[PDB]
Amino acid sequence: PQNYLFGCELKADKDYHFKVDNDENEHQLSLRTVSLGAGAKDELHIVEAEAMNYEGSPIKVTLATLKMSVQPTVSLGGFEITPPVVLRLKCGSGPVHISGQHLVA
Amino acid sequence: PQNYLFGCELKADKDYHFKVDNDENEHQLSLRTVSLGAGAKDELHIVEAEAMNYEGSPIKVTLATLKMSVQPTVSLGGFEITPPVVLRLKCGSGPVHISGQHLVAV
Amino acid sequence: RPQNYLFGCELKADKDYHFKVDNDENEHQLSLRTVSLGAGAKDELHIVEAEAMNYEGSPIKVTLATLKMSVQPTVSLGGFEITPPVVLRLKCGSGPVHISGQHLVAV
Amino acid sequence: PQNYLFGCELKADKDYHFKVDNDENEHQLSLRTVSLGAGAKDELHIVEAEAMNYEGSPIKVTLATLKMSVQPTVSLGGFEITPPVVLRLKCGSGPVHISGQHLVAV
Amino acid sequence: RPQNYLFGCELKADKDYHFKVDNDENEHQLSLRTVSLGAGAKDELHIVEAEAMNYEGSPIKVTLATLKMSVQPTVSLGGFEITPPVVLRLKCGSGPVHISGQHLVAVE
Ligand SMILES: [Co+2]
Ligand SMILES: [Co+2]
Ligand SMILES: [Co+2]
Ligand SMILES: [Co+2]
Ligand SMILES: [Co+2]
């Protein structure tokens, strides 16, 4: 597939909606790293993703639990998710950075 | 191969059974991360998966050992398991979250 | 796609694990995923080794992971495939140490 | 596809440009690890990559947050990016090292 | 699918590792999996580097991992493939540091 860089920043009041325009193209979001930004203090941060499960209902899943003094970056190794996907902070002020690839076949 | 989002929550008194209707061989659970929940205490948490070995018997294996002050998240990198699978906390009260993909072959 | 079965074992000082497959027409691989310390392990260094054949036709020993409860209780290997036979053991530390992975069989 | 080793060192005010090559081959940069170098201090380091998004515009993303006393190395597992790519330290003085593979389809 | 053999080496301030082959280098890949501090390693910074050919055809040195016993004694590289010849060495620290991985061989 074609491969484009993806990223976003999450905050307590800022989520991210990944949606792709309808067309003759199949899209995947492949998540790589979740990293705490400066401004996360030392509070617990939990990042969640919401998208469709196999049985056709939205589910919310926890991608990572981070804390600056313990584990500031988690590497997901290319966690692919079919859009639409919402990414949000379940707790923590943020910022939390997300990186990955937007794959198009 | 279609790809759907998967996750579950585990607690001391709550496991998770991943099962599929008919063609178990066309389905794979691909585990990504095991994460401690908000509200988990700082005790040792150990997560276990139970599924079939080649010899045809269920076996119990340890997926991850976590502790809030040391390692609150473990990334498994797409550990595929053929259903049925049971996921449970062997140790700790949780909540512990698991995320991954439910992959379906065509 | 190969068939995929679950694999795991527990290691202790003086308790290793021999993974071997019976003869057949198929190709087998052991794909190692995680190494994790178990409850009650001493908070000391644990070193896990794997033994299997090298390219030159001799069994060799390699270190898969170094773990310690208060620092790094789990290491994820990401699917380290090894052709059987494989012997897994603790080179040091009390254990218990758990290993998980997949037994892949291509027909 | 041919496989070549790639690496760079980043510092404050010292970034890296992985440039479109002057050939008609297909190229990918696949990032493997980001690691703090000797002499890096214990401040937060944030490493960023800039490259083209799906819509055609350049974007800046965070690859890793590192701190010597907590997490001196992050493994990305083969994060492929299409050139051109700029790698830089957003925060921290470094040195920070990046390693990976230059993949070429000829 | 390539033949898949086990690979490992030990590094020390004392000792590096040269991975080389006598036949066609392009049929071989070293796929690195883990870098781990050994028993006997102290708590100083350890930095492991690899040296191998870049696209332009000259040798380049890269850092594979930075380890410290009290912080991060093992780094998993997830199958970092390199074409021989390759040299692995400690740039910093006295070790021992162990490396494990796969030696992959293309079948003609
Ligand atoms: Co919203
Ligand atoms: Co049950
Ligand atoms: Co034995
Ligand atoms: Co510049
Ligand atoms: Co030498």
Short mmCIF file of N, CA and C and ligand atoms in Angstrom, two decimals, chain D residues 15-17 86 88, ligand 4:
data_model
loop_
_atom_site.label_atom_id
_atom_site.label_comp_id
_atom_site.label_asym_id
_atom_site.label_seq_id
_atom_site.Cartn_x
_atom_site.Cartn_y
_atom_site.Cartn_z
N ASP D 15 19.77 18.89 12.60
CA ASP D 15 18.79 17.89 12.19
C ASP D 15 19.34 17.03 11.06
N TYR D 16 18.48 16.18 10.50
CA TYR D 16 18.89 15.33 9.39
C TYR D 16 17.85 15.36 8.28
N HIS D 17 18.33 15.51 7.05
CA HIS D 17 17.46 15.49 5.88
C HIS D 17 17.70 14.23 5.09
N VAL D 86 12.47 14.84 7.22
CA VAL D 86 13.38 15.57 8.07
C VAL D 86 13.25 15.03 9.48
N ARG D 88 14.41 15.66 13.50
CA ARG D 88 14.94 16.74 14.35
C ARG D 88 14.63 16.55 15.82
CO CO F 4 16.90 21.51 8.42
#
